[PDB]
Design a protein around this motif. Structure first.
Motif, PDB file in Angstrom:
ATOM      1  N   UNK A 158       4.251 -63.299  33.688  1.00  0.00           N
ATOM      2  CA  UNK A 158       5.016 -62.399  34.543  1.00  0.00           C
ATOM      3  C   UNK A 158       5.221 -61.077  33.815  1.00  0.00           C
ATOM      4  N   UNK A 159       4.911 -59.977  34.493  1.00  0.00           N
ATOM      5  CA  UNK A 159       5.093 -58.633  33.957  1.00  0.00           C
ATOM      6  C   UNK A 159       6.356 -58.048  34.573  1.00  0.00           C
ATOM      7  N   UNK A 160       7.297 -57.629  33.728  1.00  0.00           N
ATOM      8  CA  UNK A 160       8.519 -56.984  34.188  1.00  0.00           C
ATOM      9  C   UNK A 160       8.674 -55.647  33.482  1.00  0.00           C
ATOM     10  N   UNK A 161       9.403 -54.728  34.110  1.00  0.00           N
ATOM     11  CA  UNK A 161       9.609 -53.388  33.573  1.00  0.00           C
ATOM     12  C   UNK A 161      11.072 -53.005  33.737  1.00  0.00           C
ATOM     13  N   UNK A 162      11.728 -52.676  32.625  1.00  0.00           N
ATOM     14  CA  UNK A 162      13.099 -52.179  32.648  1.00  0.00           C
ATOM     15  C   UNK A 162      13.065 -50.679  32.388  1.00  0.00           C
ATOM     16  N   UNK A 163      13.819 -49.933  33.195  1.00  0.00           N
ATOM     17  CA  UNK A 163      13.638 -48.493  33.335  1.00  0.00           C
ATOM     18  C   UNK A 163      14.477 -47.686  32.350  1.00  0.00           C
ATOM     19  N   UNK A 164      15.754 -48.047  32.186  1.00  0.00           N
ATOM     20  CA  UNK A 164      16.648 -47.249  31.344  1.00  0.00           C
ATOM     21  C   UNK A 164      16.155 -47.146  29.905  1.00  0.00           C
ATOM     22  N   UNK A 165      15.782 -48.236  29.222  1.00  0.00           N
ATOM     23  CA  UNK A 165      15.140 -48.079  27.910  1.00  0.00           C
ATOM     24  C   UNK A 165      13.654 -47.781  27.989  1.00  0.00           C
ATOM     25  N   UNK A 166      13.069 -47.770  29.189  1.00  0.00           N
ATOM     26  CA  UNK A 166      11.644 -47.502  29.388  1.00  0.00           C
ATOM     27  C   UNK A 166      10.794 -48.491  28.585  1.00  0.00           C
ATOM     28  N   UNK A 167      10.907 -49.765  28.958  1.00  0.00           N
ATOM     29  CA  UNK A 167      10.210 -50.825  28.244  1.00  0.00           C
ATOM     30  C   UNK A 167       9.598 -51.802  29.239  1.00  0.00           C
ATOM     31  N   UNK A 168       8.581 -52.524  28.771  1.00  0.00           N
ATOM     32  CA  UNK A 168       7.859 -53.488  29.586  1.00  0.00           C
ATOM     33  C   UNK A 168       7.774 -54.813  28.844  1.00  0.00           C
ATOM     34  N   UNK A 169       8.031 -55.901  29.564  1.00  0.00           N
ATOM     35  CA  UNK A 169       8.089 -57.219  28.958  1.00  0.00           C
ATOM     36  C   UNK A 169       7.127 -58.164  29.661  1.00  0.00           C
ATOM     37  N   UNK A 170       6.623 -59.112  28.879  1.00  0.00           N
ATOM     38  CA  UNK A 170       5.795 -60.204  29.361  1.00  0.00           C
ATOM     39  C   UNK A 170       6.543 -61.514  29.162  1.00  0.00           C
ATOM     40  N   UNK A 171       6.643 -62.291  30.237  1.00  0.00           N
ATOM     41  CA  UNK A 171       7.376 -63.550  30.256  1.00  0.00           C
ATOM     42  C   UNK A 171       6.384 -64.675  30.513  1.00  0.00           C
ATOM     43  N   UNK A 172       6.478 -65.733  29.713  1.00  0.00           N
ATOM     44  CA  UNK A 172       5.613 -66.894  29.843  1.00  0.00           C
ATOM     45  C   UNK A 172       6.444 -68.118  30.207  1.00  0.00           C
ATOM     46  N   UNK A 173       5.799 -69.063  30.894  1.00  0.00           N
ATOM     47  CA  UNK A 173       6.485 -70.274  31.326  1.00  0.00           C
ATOM     48  C   UNK A 173       6.893 -71.162  30.158  1.00  0.00           C
ATOM     49  N   UNK A 174       6.258 -71.003  28.996  1.00  0.00           N
ATOM     50  CA  UNK A 174       6.584 -71.820  27.834  1.00  0.00           C
ATOM     51  C   UNK A 174       7.914 -71.443  27.194  1.00  0.00           C
ATOM     52  N   UNK A 175       8.563 -70.377  27.657  1.00  0.00           N
ATOM     53  CA  UNK A 175       9.826 -69.942  27.103  1.00  0.00           C
ATOM     54  C   UNK A 175       9.750 -68.742  26.185  1.00  0.00           C
ATOM     55  N   UNK A 176       8.552 -68.244  25.891  1.00  0.00           N
ATOM     56  CA  UNK A 176       8.388 -67.081  25.033  1.00  0.00           C
ATOM     57  C   UNK A 176       8.368 -65.808  25.869  1.00  0.00           C
ATOM     58  N   UNK A 177       8.888 -64.726  25.295  1.00  0.00           N
ATOM     59  CA  UNK A 177       8.901 -63.429  25.954  1.00  0.00           C
ATOM     60  C   UNK A 177       8.636 -62.355  24.911  1.00  0.00           C
ATOM     61  N   UNK A 178       7.948 -61.290  25.316  1.00  0.00           N
ATOM     62  CA  UNK A 178       7.608 -60.207  24.400  1.00  0.00           C
ATOM     63  C   UNK A 178       7.936 -58.874  25.059  1.00  0.00           C
TER      64      UNK A 178
END
Ligand SMILES: [Zn+2]
Ligand SMILES: [Zn+2]
Lengths: 111, 50, 88, 49, 98, 176, 361, 46
Positions: F42-62
């Protein structure tokens, strides 16, 4: 056996070849009203690249990603302004606007 | 272009007008030579374009 | 090609390396005797520091020989070919 | 692969050259198409005079 | 080098494989050229027979040929493709000494 | 050296200690993208800090795009709160800075051939492929992209002090 | 050493067709006679290598055999000496020792062969562009470059820099302008040595004026040889262009080359302004080629005067008043949470969820 | 130490060091002879 189907072509005479090392991926340019409709689609749906690519038959997914990244890099203020305002999901009027954009680009190509 | 040994052989055959009675035989060895029993002839020729 | 192995006692090259020039190659114009080297060739033994063993080109001859010319050429394999023309 | 094969990428240029060089230098000619096995065809030119 | 080689090339002008038909390699004309040396990096240079005697190399000329083939059923023609090296006899027609 | 580099990108991963359902978080979130036909994250984007995260079903996020470690921590906490609001026991455990990319400039031209002639064992310069010289310093294990314009990009560090020391060590090599 | 006195001054001297060891002090020998092989048996004895006599060269997979045969045919079609083939096969056998390299597709092995022969030619001062190598490979150049970077990062072998003079020597000879073939008029024919020297001088001028750093060399070489060909006869060649020259020479012209040419032309202008007669002549981008030789006569002082008034890409030469603008320090994060309405803004409403489910139903 | 050589066609004194590609300026010939030594040599007229 083929009969007069292919034409002779001279290519690559085995000399010193220029090292291109460039694959210029052809991308359709962006218009003003096209940018406005892309911005309103973003404001209506969010950052879901799949749904945006589905409602953009004239565009590609990688092109949408590049445009979104360049917009976030350059006009973050307009990006946040569009994200603050919300608008309900429209389908019929969206198709009417798509037909209007088709007619506009056809008139532009006629010019 | 003429070989060094051939050049020395040709130079050895050239007669000398020196009177042999005024000189003596060189002793065994003594390659340096003395005033009595040797003579020196210098030959330096450098060819160049006119 | 190593240089002439000068004798520290007399500060002059040895009788075997007497006819060699500064580059280790015999110079034309001199006389060559038996058991004398013409090219002080040394080759590596690996094919960490390279180990070179000496394989000089000695002159086998009953009488003396005079060097007329020494030609040095380079092929496409970067191999230096040295040809000495001995005259008797 | 779908990458169409062409002969230019395999036109070995050293085959004929090495064949000619060996046949002229060594002097032995072995033609299997004609079953000809000859030796001493080429000889070192005598530069005595 | 002027008549017989052309006849030999004409005798084997077309070569093809049984598998994947409609594919062929057609020879058009073969040339021997002038004697040269490949000492230079991908560059030919006129060399005298005495230089070949000195450098312990061969006195040969690059045998090239122009051909036409089919890569992907698109006929591609080559006008200058070297294929070998023929040793040039001294004082011949193509020798530099004549 | 009188010049301080500017960190531009921060990459850091964090484990949530629980399993997630990608379809659920992609269905109830406006900034979520999930296309299982190509990429199973899953690709998510948070705007205020201008950052993008990748979420995996295994519980890891980057996370990517941050400027400092504190901004990356704030973005990770925001994403953890978002995941918790969707009915998931997300936790903020095992947080460590993974990579940092920064840019800088020297304001003078640099000869990319003298460097590869003097530091061949530390760089691989190929102008036929990429214009910028690629320098790989082994003591801090830092990769540097250098250009004729003088602006240099540094990557491979774990803390800002590593980027600073790499820049202050590469500065005399570029000046010389 | 000496068995009686103990003197270790034993010297090897050749006797009358006899080799022996003798001490120079007492003249006593310690070992006489030597055993040497005869050429009568030398031609009969057969060769044995270490790999075949250890069990290696038999554990060679079909893919490894295909790769080595590919290396062989690739170095043979280029007419490389056998030393190049030996070095290339040695590098291939050395690189094939990794587990990640042996387990790959045919594309990876082919681009590895290409990179190996590239390194082989780079070692012995043999210039060869990667384009000519990728031409003989059934692959693309991007994956070739990626695998090249990967293997030079994994091995870290010596990679010499591409020499510009040798590259010019290899590239200028490819043109057909030296022979008066019927496909080219006699007015365009020139001497190979003069053109090569002019192109070498021009590429040296480009090197000293920052025109080889970053940009590909081949377009600069094409621009240099084009300027040389134009300067050799501007009376009948100034009306031509780079596209016309490349079409006549039957060589694919580089796309940026013309632009590079322009830059070089600009350099010529920056030189022509220094020479008094040229600065009085008031030349332009077109009439500057006819004096290129003069510019090459005293190029040192010209480039020194030009640099005393460097070269950078035109994108940054627009007078940048803000260089690397400092971002504002905003490393704050509040106490524990700045706000909570953001989460309410990012979530989907039930109506939006239903619309999303209906859109891609 | 300056090592000197003579080309085969121009016959000019060229100074090259070790491990250099055998060539000559203002030409392209690759035959490089060594100059005659300066040491004294004694010959016999026999
Ligand atoms: Zn003793
Ligand atoms: Zn010369």
């Amino acid at each position: 056996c083929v009969v007069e189907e292919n034409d002779p072509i001279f290519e690559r005479g085995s000399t010193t070849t220029y090292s291109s090392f460039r694959k210029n991926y052809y991308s359709k340019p962006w218009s003003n009203k096209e940018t406005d409709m892309f911005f309103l689609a973003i404001s209506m749906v969010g950052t879901d690249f799949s749904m945006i690519g589905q409602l953009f038959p004239h565009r590609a997914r990688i092109e949408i990603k590049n445009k979104f990244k360049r917009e976030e890099k350059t006009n973050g203020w307009r990006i946040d302004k569009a994200f603050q305002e919300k608008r309900p999901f429209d389908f019929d009027f969206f198709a009417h606007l798509l037909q209007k954009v088709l007619a506009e680009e056809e008139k532009r190509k006629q010019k | 272009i003429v070989q060094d040994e051939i050049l020395a052989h040709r130079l050895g055959l050239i007669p000398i007008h020196a009177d042999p009675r005024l000189f003596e035989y060189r002793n065994q060895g003594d390659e340096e030579g003395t005033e009595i029993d040797t003579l020196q002839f210098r030959l330096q020729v450098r060819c160049t374009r006119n | 090609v190593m240089g002439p192995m000068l004798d520290a006692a007399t500060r002059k090259p040895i009788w075997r390396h007497e006819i060699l020039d500064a580059d280790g190659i015999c110079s034309p114009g001199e006389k060559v005797e038996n058991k004398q080297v013409l090219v002080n060739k040394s080759m590596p033994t690996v094919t960490q520091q390279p180990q070179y063993k000496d394989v000089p080109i000695t002159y086998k001859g009953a009488t003396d020989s005079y060097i007329e010319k020494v030609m040095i050429s380079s092929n496409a394999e970067d191999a230096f070919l040295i040809k000495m023309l001995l005259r008797q | 692969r779908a990458a169409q094969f062409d002969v230019v990428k395999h036109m070995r240029q050293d085959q004929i050259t090495n064949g000619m060089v060996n046949a002229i230098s060594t002097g032995n000619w072995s033609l299997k198409r004609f079953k000809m096995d000859r030796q001493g065809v080429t000889q070192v030119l005598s530069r005595l005079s | 080098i002027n008549v017989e080689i052309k006849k030999i090339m004409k005798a084997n002008e077309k070569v093809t494989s049984d598998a994947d038909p409609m594919w062929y390699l057609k020879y058009l004309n073969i040339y021997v050229g002038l004697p040269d040396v490949e000492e230079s990096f991908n560059v030919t240079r006129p060399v005298s027979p005495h230089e070949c005697r000195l450098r312990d190399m061969t006195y040969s000329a690059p045998i090239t040929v122009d051909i036409e083939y089919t890569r992907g059923s698109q006929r591609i023609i080559r006008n200058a493709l070297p294929i070998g090296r023929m040793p040039i006899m001294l004082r011949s027609s193509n020798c530099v000494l004549t | 050296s009188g010049i301080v580099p500017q960190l531009q990108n921060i990459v850091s991963t964090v484990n949530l200690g629980c399993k997630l359902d990608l379809k659920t978080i992609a269905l109830r979130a406006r900034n979520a993208e999930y296309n299982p036909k190509r990429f199973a994250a899953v690709i998510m984007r948070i705007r205020e800090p201008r950052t993008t995260a990748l979420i995996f079903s295994s519980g890891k996020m980057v996370c990517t795009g941050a400027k400092s470690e504190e901004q990356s921590r704030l973005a990770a906490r925001k994403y953890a709160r978002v995941v918790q609001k969707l009915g998931f026991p997300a936790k903020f455990l095992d947080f460590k800075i993974q990579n940092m990319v920064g840019s800088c400039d020297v304001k003078f031209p640099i000869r990319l051939e003298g460097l590869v002639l003097t530091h061949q064992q530390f760089s691989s310069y190929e102008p036929e492929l990429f214009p910028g010289l690629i320098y790989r310093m082994i003591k801090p294990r830092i990769v540097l992209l250098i250009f004729v314009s003088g602006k240099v990009v540094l990557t491979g560090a774990k803390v800002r002090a590593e980027i600073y020391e790499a820049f202050e060590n590469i500065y005399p090599i570029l000046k010389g | 050493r000496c068995p009686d006195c103990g003197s270790t001054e034993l010297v090897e001297d050749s006797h009358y067709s006899q080799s022996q060891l003798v001490c120079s002090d007492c003249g006593c020998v310690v070992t006489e006679g030597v055993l040497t092989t005869t050429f009568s048996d030398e031609g009969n004895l057969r060769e044995v290598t270490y790999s075949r006599s250890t069990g290696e060269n038999e554990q060679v997979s079909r893919s490894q055999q295909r790769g080595l045969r590919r290396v062989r045919d690739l170095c043979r079609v280029l007419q490389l000496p056998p030393t190049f083939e030996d070095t290339a096969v040695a590098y291939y056998q050395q690189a094939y020792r990794h587990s990640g390299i042996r387990a790959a597709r045919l594309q990876k092995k082919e681009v590895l062969v290409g990179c190996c022969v590239l390194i082989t030619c780079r070692q012995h001062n043999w210039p060869l562009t990667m384009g000519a190598i990728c031409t003989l490979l059934y692959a693309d150049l991007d994956v070739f470059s990626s695998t090249y970077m990967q293997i030079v990062k994994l091995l870290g072998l010596d990679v010499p820099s591409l020499c510009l003079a040798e590259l010019v020597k290899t590239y200028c000879s490819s043109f057909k302008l030296f022979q008066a073939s019927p496909s080219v008029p006699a007015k365009y024919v020139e001497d190979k040595e003069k053109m090569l020297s002019r192109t070498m001088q021009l590429v040296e001028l480009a090197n000293e004026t920052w025109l080889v750093t970053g940009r590909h060399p081949l377009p600069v070489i094409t621009a240099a040889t084009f300027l040389a060909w134009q300067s050799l006869q501007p009376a009948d060649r100034l009306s031509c262009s780079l596209a016309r020259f490349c079409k006549l020479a039957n060589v694919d012209l580089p796309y940026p080359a013309s632009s590079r040419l322009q830059e070089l032309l600009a350099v010529l202008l920056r030189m022509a302004e220094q020479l008094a007669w040229l600065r009085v002549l008031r030349l332009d981008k077109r009439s500057v080629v006819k004096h290129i030789g003069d510019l090459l006569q005293h190029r040192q002082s010209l480039v020194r005067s030009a640099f005393r008034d460097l070269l950078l890409p035109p994108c940054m030469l627009k007078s940048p008043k803000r260089i690397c603008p400092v971002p504002p320090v905003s490393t704050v994060t509040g106490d524990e949470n700045i706000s909570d309405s953001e989460i309410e803004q990012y979530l989907r409403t039930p109506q939006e969820v239903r619309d999303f489910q209906r859109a891609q139903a | 130490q300056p090592m000197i050589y003579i080309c085969g066609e121009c016959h000019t004194e060229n100074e090259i060091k070790s491990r250099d590609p055998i060539r000559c300026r203002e030409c392209g010939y690759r035959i490089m002879y060594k100059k005659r030594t300066k040491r004294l040599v004694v010959f016999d007229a026999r």
